[PDB]
Design a protein around this motif. Structure first.
Motif, PDB file in Angstrom:
ATOM      1  N   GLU A   1      -0.261  -4.451   3.561  1.00 52.67           N
ATOM      2  CA  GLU A   1      -0.681  -3.068   3.323  1.00 52.67           C
ATOM      3  C   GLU A   1      -0.550  -2.166   4.542  1.00 52.67           C
ATOM      4  OE1 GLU A   1      -3.518  -4.955   1.619  1.00 52.67           O
ATOM      5  OE2 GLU A   1      -2.719  -4.462  -0.395  1.00 52.67           O
TER       6      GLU A   1
ATOM      7  N   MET B   1       0.836   1.877   0.506  1.00 50.56           N
ATOM      8  CA  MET B   1       0.120   2.703   1.431  1.00 50.56           C
ATOM      9  C   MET B   1      -1.290   2.790   0.906  1.00 50.56           C
ATOM     10  SD  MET B   1       2.868   3.779   3.287  1.00 50.56           S
ATOM     11  CE  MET B   1       3.833   4.819   2.162  1.00 50.56           C
ATOM     12  N   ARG B   2      -2.189   2.043   1.528  1.00 50.74           N
ATOM     13  CA  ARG B   2      -3.573   2.143   1.160  1.00 50.74           C
ATOM     14  C   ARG B   2      -4.133   3.414   1.763  1.00 50.74           C
ATOM     15  NH1 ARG B   2      -7.070  -2.730   2.335  1.00 50.74           N
ATOM     16  NH2 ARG B   2      -6.908  -3.101   0.070  1.00 50.74           N
ATOM     17  N   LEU B   3      -3.521   3.885   2.842  1.00 52.11           N
ATOM     18  CA  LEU B   3      -3.965   5.078   3.536  1.00 52.11           C
ATOM     19  C   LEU B   3      -2.773   5.901   3.967  1.00 52.11           C
ATOM     20  CD1 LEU B   3      -6.050   6.859   4.618  1.00 52.11           C
ATOM     21  CD2 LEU B   3      -6.391   5.316   6.546  1.00 52.11           C
ATOM     22  N   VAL B   4      -2.791   7.198   3.666  1.00 56.34           N
ATOM     23  CA  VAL B   4      -1.809   8.117   4.255  1.00 56.34           C
ATOM     24  C   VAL B   4      -2.542   9.194   5.072  1.00 56.34           C
ATOM     25  CG1 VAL B   4       0.150   9.628   3.820  1.00 56.34           C
ATOM     26  CG2 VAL B   4      -0.207   7.709   2.360  1.00 56.34           C
ATOM     27  N   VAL B   5      -2.102   9.445   6.304  1.00 57.68           N
ATOM     28  CA  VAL B   5      -2.779  10.402   7.208  1.00 57.68           C
ATOM     29  C   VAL B   5      -1.763  11.403   7.776  1.00 57.68           C
ATOM     30  CG1 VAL B   5      -4.485   8.661   7.848  1.00 57.68           C
ATOM     31  CG2 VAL B   5      -2.489   9.026   9.296  1.00 57.68           C
ATOM     32  N   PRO B   6      -2.170  12.656   8.057  1.00 59.65           N
ATOM     33  CA  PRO B   6      -1.138  13.620   8.472  1.00 59.65           C
ATOM     34  C   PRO B   6      -0.552  13.420   9.877  1.00 59.65           C
ATOM     35  CG  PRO B   6      -3.261  14.659   8.407  1.00 59.65           C
ATOM     36  CD  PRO B   6      -3.465  13.310   7.823  1.00 59.65           C
TER      37      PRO B   6
ATOM     38  N   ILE C   1      -8.054   2.680  13.414  1.00 57.04           N
ATOM     39  CA  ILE C   1      -7.963   2.150  12.065  1.00 57.04           C
ATOM     40  C   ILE C   1      -7.425   0.744  12.106  1.00 57.04           C
ATOM     41  CG2 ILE C   1      -7.025   2.372   9.764  1.00 57.04           C
ATOM     42  CD1 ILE C   1      -6.798   5.392  10.317  1.00 57.04           C
TER      43      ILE C   1
ATOM     44  N   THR D   1      -9.125  -3.100  10.902  1.00 61.90           N
ATOM     45  CA  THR D   1      -8.589  -3.300   9.575  1.00 61.90           C
ATOM     46  C   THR D   1      -7.430  -4.288   9.628  1.00 61.90           C
ATOM     47  OG1 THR D   1      -8.107  -2.042   7.553  1.00 61.90           O
ATOM     48  CG2 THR D   1      -6.850  -1.463   9.541  1.00 61.90           C
TER      49      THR D   1
ATOM     50  N   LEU E   1      -4.606  -3.499   8.108  1.00 61.64           N
ATOM     51  CA  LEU E   1      -3.425  -2.719   7.828  1.00 61.64           C
ATOM     52  C   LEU E   1      -2.425  -2.886   8.970  1.00 61.64           C
ATOM     53  CD1 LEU E   1      -5.089   0.425   6.318  1.00 61.64           C
ATOM     54  CD2 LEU E   1      -4.445  -1.646   5.184  1.00 61.64           C
TER      55      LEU E   1
ATOM     56  N   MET F   1     -12.035   2.217   5.230  1.00 59.14           N
ATOM     57  CA  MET F   1     -10.982   1.294   4.833  1.00 59.14           C
ATOM     58  C   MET F   1     -11.527  -0.116   4.759  1.00 59.14           C
ATOM     59  SD  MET F   1      -8.377   2.733   3.938  1.00 59.14           S
ATOM     60  CE  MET F   1      -8.590   4.475   3.647  1.00 59.14           C
TER      61      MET F   1
ATOM     62  N   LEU G   1     -13.320  -0.306   1.404  1.00 60.79           N
ATOM     63  CA  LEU G   1     -12.452  -0.285   0.231  1.00 60.79           C
ATOM     64  C   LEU G   1     -11.725  -1.608   0.057  1.00 60.79           C
ATOM     65  CD1 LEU G   1     -10.734   3.197   0.228  1.00 60.79           C
ATOM     66  CD2 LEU G   1     -12.788   2.509  -1.076  1.00 60.79           C
ATOM     67  N   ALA G   2     -11.528  -2.299   1.168  1.00 59.07           N
ATOM     68  CA  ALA G   2     -10.934  -3.609   1.158  1.00 59.07           C
ATOM     69  C   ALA G   2     -11.733  -4.530   0.237  1.00 59.07           C
ATOM     70  CB  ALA G   2     -10.915  -4.151   2.556  1.00 59.07           C
TER      71      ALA G   2
ATOM     72  N   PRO H   1      -9.879  -2.420  -3.710  1.00 58.47           N
ATOM     73  CA  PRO H   1      -8.685  -2.632  -2.894  1.00 58.47           C
ATOM     74  C   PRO H   1      -7.363  -2.071  -3.465  1.00 58.47           C
ATOM     75  CG  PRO H   1      -9.689  -4.714  -3.644  1.00 58.47           C
ATOM     76  CD  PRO H   1     -10.195  -3.614  -4.504  1.00 58.47           C
TER      77      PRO H   1
ATOM     78  N   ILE I   1      -7.157   1.328  -4.857  1.00 60.73           N
ATOM     79  CA  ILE I   1      -7.088   2.782  -4.781  1.00 60.73           C
ATOM     80  C   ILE I   1      -6.379   3.220  -3.496  1.00 60.73           C
ATOM     81  CG2 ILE I   1      -9.223   3.129  -6.159  1.00 60.73           C
ATOM     82  CD1 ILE I   1     -10.798   3.247  -3.798  1.00 60.73           C
ATOM     83  N   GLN I   2      -5.770   4.404  -3.521  1.00 60.82           N
ATOM     84  CA  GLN I   2      -5.164   4.961  -2.324  1.00 60.82           C
ATOM     85  C   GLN I   2      -5.885   6.217  -1.857  1.00 60.82           C
ATOM     86  OE1 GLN I   2      -0.622   4.850  -3.264  1.00 60.82           O
ATOM     87  NE2 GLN I   2      -1.733   4.220  -5.119  1.00 60.82           N
ATOM     88  N   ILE I   3      -6.226   6.241  -0.579  1.00 63.36           N
ATOM     89  CA  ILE I   3      -6.726   7.441   0.084  1.00 63.36           C
ATOM     90  C   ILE I   3      -5.575   8.173   0.794  1.00 63.36           C
ATOM     91  CG2 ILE I   3      -8.355   8.364   1.774  1.00 63.36           C
ATOM     92  CD1 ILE I   3      -9.778   6.934  -0.560  1.00 63.36           C
ATOM     93  N   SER I   4      -5.482   9.471   0.563  1.00 66.57           N
ATOM     94  CA  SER I   4      -4.658  10.309   1.420  1.00 66.57           C
ATOM     95  C   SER I   4      -5.540  11.384   2.063  1.00 66.57           C
ATOM     96  CB  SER I   4      -3.489  10.941   0.645  1.00 66.57           C
ATOM     97  OG  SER I   4      -3.773  12.282   0.246  1.00 66.57           O
ATOM     98  N   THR I   5      -5.245  11.743   3.303  1.00 64.07           N
ATOM     99  CA  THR I   5      -6.005  12.791   3.957  1.00 64.07           C
ATOM    100  C   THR I   5      -5.147  13.980   4.400  1.00 64.07           C
ATOM    101  OG1 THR I   5      -6.095  12.002   6.290  1.00 64.07           O
ATOM    102  CG2 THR I   5      -7.625  10.963   4.714  1.00 64.07           C
TER     103      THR I   5
END
Lengths: 212, 212
Positions: A106, A133-138, A146, A150, A152, B27, B30-31, B35, B37-41
């Motif tokens: 992930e 992508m469990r996480l997307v950040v700008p 992170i 984690t 990831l 994160m 959520l793990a 586990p 779902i996707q977070i975007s910020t």
């Protein structure tokens, strides 16, 4: 021509990665060689970068920046590779990581919108590589923290990685996919080509960061 | 929903500070709990957050956010005190710092436009405090590395500081000027107060992050 004297304010344009890499050692050298000059920075996105550099409001730009073509002088500092990053005790991620493993794990993605670093998502997507992508950040500020707490893993530029590796106890691996080299260049507008202060400063840049 | 089985993308709004502090522990949770779902910020000062939040393009926001007033709900998570930060082996810098010493030393400033961390520039300036600013930067990414390498001090949220201390070799000091506390709130729009997905995640924020 003794720098200690100057009291000037330079405006510098760089990305977040840039700032974090360039700025700490620039500040060291400034402390002993020119402790009275003031630096401020800003993201290339933020303005008409072109127009700002022309009218002298931005003395220098660091980065990839394709738009900066005619009327700008350019100087090559270094090329760096995208690199795979994860925490040092990650229970499974190997170095060198394989292309198979890179699909299964992930990720945290970084959008890096309107930079060189945003090419990444698309090139992978087009090689047929769908990452979870469990996480997307700008942007990149969080990746250290992170990845550290984690399991990831991230796709990251090699000079970012080397900043984060001791602080956050992470390791690196060469990237299992084919990604282009990212090339960090230094840019100034033609009008400031023979401006004493400008020359001096960029000479400093090339000394500290040029890998030749 | 079945949190475990869920497959939903959550769009979240926060400052680069927020990302850094909220994302890792989130994160890690959520793990275990959700586990798939996707977070975007994203940042608040991009798009039209009021309109986006109402629209559903943005599910929740965290931070100060005064403009979000009607139609928007809130919940205080914690108040952080601003603090003073500098590298461990600094020569002059002493904790607790004298107001006088604070002016004698050189700073790095974060401009941090349209965050609650923007009032600082003036708050201090209107309180009759002058400080020599050797470096000014749009955000926080480079703050830790800079202080590590240099003799600059910085005015920074205590929580940023604790996340920074050990990785970048840094200690703090109660800030020797009258600055206020700063409130971080969990926000959401009225259309989604009773949404099972939104509720669940909000509740998870309350659980992990609330000082009470």
């Amino acid at each position: 021509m003794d720098p200690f004297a100057s009291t000037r304010t330079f405006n510098l344009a760089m990305t977040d990665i840039g700032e974090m890499y360039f700025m700490p050692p620039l500040m060291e050298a400034l402390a002993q060689r020119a402790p009275h000059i003031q630096i401020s920075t800003l993201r290339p996105n933020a303005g008409n970068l072109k127009e700002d550099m022309e009218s002298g409001a931005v003395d220098l730009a660091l980065g990839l920046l394709p738009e900066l073509q005619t009327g700008f002088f350019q100087r090559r500092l270094f090329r760096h590779r995208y690199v795979c990053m994860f925490r040092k005790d990650h229970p499974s991620a190997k170095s060198p990581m394989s292309l198979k493993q890179f699909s299964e794990l992930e990720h945290v993605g970084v959008v890096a919108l309107n930079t060189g670093h945003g090419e990444v998502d698309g090139l992978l997507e087009r090689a047929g590589i769908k990452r979870r992508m469990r996480l997307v950040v700008p942007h990149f500020i969080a990746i250290g923290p992170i990845l550290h707490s984690t399991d990831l893993i991230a796709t990251v530029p090699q000079r970012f990685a080397v900043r984060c590796e001791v602080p956050f106890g992470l390791t690196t691996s060469p990237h299992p996919a084919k990604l282009p080299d990212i090339a960090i260049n230094l840019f100034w507008h033609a009008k400031y080509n023979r401006d004493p202060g400008n020359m001096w400063l960029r000479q400093l840049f090339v000394e500290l960061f040029s890998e030749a």
